[PDB]
Amino acid sequence: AVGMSNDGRFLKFDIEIGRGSFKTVYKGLDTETTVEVAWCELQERKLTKSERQRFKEEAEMLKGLQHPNIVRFYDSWESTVKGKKCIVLVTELMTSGTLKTYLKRFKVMKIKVLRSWCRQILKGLQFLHTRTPPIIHRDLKCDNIFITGPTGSVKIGDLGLATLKRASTPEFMAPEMYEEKYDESVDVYAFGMCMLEMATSEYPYSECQNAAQIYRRVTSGVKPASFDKVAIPEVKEIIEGCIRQNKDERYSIKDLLNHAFFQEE
Structure with missing residues (x-):
């Protein structure tokens, strides 16, 4: 109609x-x-x-x-x-909202949920990365991870939109991305910031007042203050591995999937 x-x-x-x-x-x-x-x-x-x-x-x-x-x-x-x-x-059709809407609603997440959803995101990313050729999302964030509702799983979304962006507040992004440099490891960085936001219910670098301040910190390898608030040791460890300044020194997705955190539940 x-x-x-x-x-x-x-x-x-x-x-x-x-x-x-x-x-x-x-x-x-x-x-x-x-x-x-x-x-x-x-x-x-x-x-x-x-x-x-x-x-x-x-x-x-x-x-x-x-x-x-x-x-x-x-x-x-x-x-x-x-x-x-x-x-x-x-x-x-995804009707059940996003991680972002979930977090805005409850402002807290149980560890069991965070583990299961973060595993699902990693499996999604590894699937994209091991296409021929690789698909790098490059725009991963909480507001384009969607909840299903049946089984309450998560899916990575806005693949069309991401493609449009790749074909040519906006935001913080991995340090290399400021120089329009990227490989698979930009998705790992974004994963890490997604997990931080899930674990704290805070937008990273909220202490900064302008983009420029955020640019300075990100490119310096100065972490957001919210990193200090993470209460779960193994989650903090995972986040740290993901948002390292040098892309070559970050955890791989295989590294992450093999972490003990994900062997727990």
Whole structure:
């Protein structure tokens, strides 16, 4: 009832599911399955053809991803209502909110939950990293890790959005990223900051008053003050391994998965 795939696969409805960054999520339907989906539009966007092709190629690889800890990506394309331009992404419908919304709601997390969810995130990342070629997310944060609800597992999401960003408050990022340098280890750094935020229910570097201060500290290897508040020894140890200044000296994902913390539960 308003939009439809060029084939006829997915339909769009007028129900809003919420907002991200002027990116509005409509409710949708996959007729081929009778499964409800997320119908995503980025309100007003466009760019160049090499960049366009780059998105198109990478996007096509997303459609072939199937993993329990990754949000399923269905399809994408550009459109112009009147009027307004946008990119449309169709993804698995996640209704049960994010880590970010969870933390904002409760402001505390049990250790058993943190262990299980952090393992799931690592398994997601390792799946992406060991595609051919590797997929680096490069924009991991609490507000694009989604909770399922059935089984209350987590999935990494906004793969389409991340691809767009890669094709070309915003934030702190690993030190190398300030020099637009990255490999797999940028996702490890982001993991570490996600785990810190889960363990403390604080946004890292909240003591800093401007980006510049954060830049200075991050590139210096000066840790956020919230690091000092972590109460669980093994969690603190894991976070420290992940947010080391030199990307080459950080824990690998294999290192992390093999940590005793995750052998506990």
